[PDB]
Paper text:
Phosphatidylinositol 5-phosphate 4-kinases (PI5P4Ks) reduce the cellular PI5P pool, using this substrate to generate PI(4,5)P2,12 which has also been shown to be required for successful autophagosome-lysosome fusion. Mammals express three isoforms (α, β, and γ) of PI5P4Ks which have differing tissue specificity and subcellular localization. Variation in catalytic site and putative G-loop sequences may account for the large differences in intrinsic in vitro kinase activity between the isoforms (PI5P4Kγ being 2000-fold less active than PI5P4Kα),19,20 although these differences may be attenuated in vivo. The α, β, and γ subtypes of PI5P4K have almost identical active site residues, with the most significant change being a methionine in PI5P4Kγ (M203) replacing a threonine in PI5P4Kβ (T201) and PI5P4Kα (T196).
To solve structures of PI5P4Kγ as cocomplexes with examples from this chemical series, a truncated version of human PI5P4Kγ comprising residues His32 to Ala421 was cloned into a bacterial expression vector. In both chains, 15 binds deeply in the hydrophobic cleft that forms the ATP binding site in lipid kinases. The hydrogen atom attached to C2 makes an aromatic hydrogen bond to the backbone carbonyl of Arg 204. The methyl group extending from the 6-position of the thienylpyrimidine ring makes contact with the side chain of Lys216 and also the phenyl ring of Phe207. The methanesulfonylphenyl moiety then runs deep along the back of the binding cavity, forming mainly hydrophobic interactions with residues Lys152, Met203, Ile373, Asp374, and Leu376. The pocket where the sulfone of 15 is located is lined with lipophilic residues: Val154, Phe185, Leu201, Met203, Ile375, and Leu376. The sulfone does not make clear H-bonding interactions in the crystal structure, although a hydrogen bond with the backbone NH of Ile375 is possible. The activation loop formed from residues 377–402 is disordered.
Residue numbers in the entry:
A (entry chain A): 45 to 135, 140 to 290, 351 to 376, 403 to 419
B (entry chain B): 45 to 136, 140 to 291, 351 to 380, 404 to 419
Amino acid sequence: DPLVGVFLWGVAHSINELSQVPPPVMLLPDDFKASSKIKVNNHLFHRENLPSHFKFKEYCPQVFRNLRDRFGIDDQDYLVSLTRNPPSESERFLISYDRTLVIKEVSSEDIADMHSNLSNYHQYIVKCHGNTLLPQFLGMYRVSVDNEDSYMLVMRNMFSHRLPVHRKYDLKGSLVSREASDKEKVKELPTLKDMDFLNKNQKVYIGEEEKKIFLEKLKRDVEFLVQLKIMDYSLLLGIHDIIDVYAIRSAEGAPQKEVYFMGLIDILVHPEQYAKRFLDFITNI
Amino acid sequence: DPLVGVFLWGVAHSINELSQVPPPVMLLPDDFKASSKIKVNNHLFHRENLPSHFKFKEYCPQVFRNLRDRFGIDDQDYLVSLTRNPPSESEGRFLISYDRTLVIKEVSSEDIADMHSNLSNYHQYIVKCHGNTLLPQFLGMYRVSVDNEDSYMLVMRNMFSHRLPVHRKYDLKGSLVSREASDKEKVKELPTLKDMDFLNKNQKVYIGEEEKKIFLEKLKRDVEFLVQLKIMDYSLLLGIHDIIIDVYAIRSAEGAPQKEVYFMGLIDILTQYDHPEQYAKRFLDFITNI
Ligand SMILES: Cc1cc2c(Nc3ccc(S(C)(=O)=O)cc3)ncnc2s1
Ligand SMILES: Cc1cc2c(Nc3ccc(S(C)(=O)=O)cc3)ncnc2s1
């Protein structure tokens, strides 16, 4: 795919360009308004695994470099995860070969919304020291191949780098409890919803100590989302039946040995009401 | 200087891009029509050691990569020579690599257009003589772009020494009209002296018949090649190191009254018709008489 090639080329280019820039002791407000653009035009030269004409744009390289550092990701390991071996594809979504990272395509409007809140997000990551249930935004890019702009967003993978997820839920806490379609339920790993969760009498057995840490994190993250006037997010719930930042192991007493994976996902009826109902639903899980 | 920074950035970029491309078993005619262009536009980023806006163009990367190989220069050593340490600035726009193995000369857009028409003829010639020539060794051709100027840069193997300092310098043409270095020129540390200066100083090159035969055979072919391309107005660069690898160096003969190392190459080979046979014969009559 031309896009993945340009994307991998671009990540290698931007990290190498960053390798020359010393990291600043502080991010200035203009670093949130910053971008790096490269336009390649090869005439009769490279026609192999990479197109002759393309553009690549990295948004706020200083901001995302610092966010990576806060999330404990070295710039070199980030590059290796993304480029040493090709990423695998899902249904537009990719996972790094090592399963540590995830690359999601987003729209131009999603990028515009992400810019308005990038400073508020950075300030929040500083305050909670990278310890959050929110997506860890690691890179934001625009790849251009044959009059087609694709906006790519790199995030830490919420699911395991080794353990396979056996059951998947998208929890919202909506008053009208949504259900996965007939078409969805025939897949190997369907994304089940609230009504599916309730109908299956599913419970998460993690123990009061881990639950307290989880609920405190969630409450702040959701309060932060409400302050940004954000709604329609979900709790991604992954269950593994018997390096992982979002993983919580089954309590010693649990009737089933499981590893749960939980994070906030569609963060791009008013916000206050969304949150209370959201938090009421996953507190009862 | 923004230009040197963009140039060094670009050389590092193009060599790394070349490091991914397997070298072809043969150069196709399109490789002589080829180029690599990169346009950078950084907004509210960098601002230290490099410009926010710039363009870099490498002409015929496959042709110049192969020419380097023929001249026995590995792509990695070429990159190190040019970028590990900054090049020193001489006079024109002319730079020398830190290690003194390479030389970078600014040229004009017309010079580049002339160089393209003859790049295939030059490559064919280098193949025939196995990189053993008195001509400049063209290693890279680039166009560096900044806010108010487009600069065409040409990398060549340095004709002078990488260790030994040149004590006397000549630009020999064999011109019917007397060529002499000006008053202003002669007050410099290393003036470029000309034909009349050479003759007035009763200058001689003491090399020995064996080395002279190799030199004159090389020169005759190179000049025949230049004439075939309708080229004239070239010069023989003569460098003399007075005694207390260099490709163009020839040491003094055992019999010589002075121990010296001479450095000789063909240099202003970009001029054409707008007569070459007459130029060549007049020129060769002059340099054989040394
Ligand atoms: C199964 C998995 C999904 C997933 C995921 N999804 C996701 C994150 C953020 C957003 S956004 C840009 O709208 O905030 C949207 C989707 N992110 C990390 N790991 C995993 S694993
Ligand atoms: C003192 C020195 C000059 C010099 C030199 N000059 C030069 C070569 C080629 C041309 S061109 C593009 O018109 O062919 C013009 C000038 N080239 C290599 N080493 C040295 S050392």
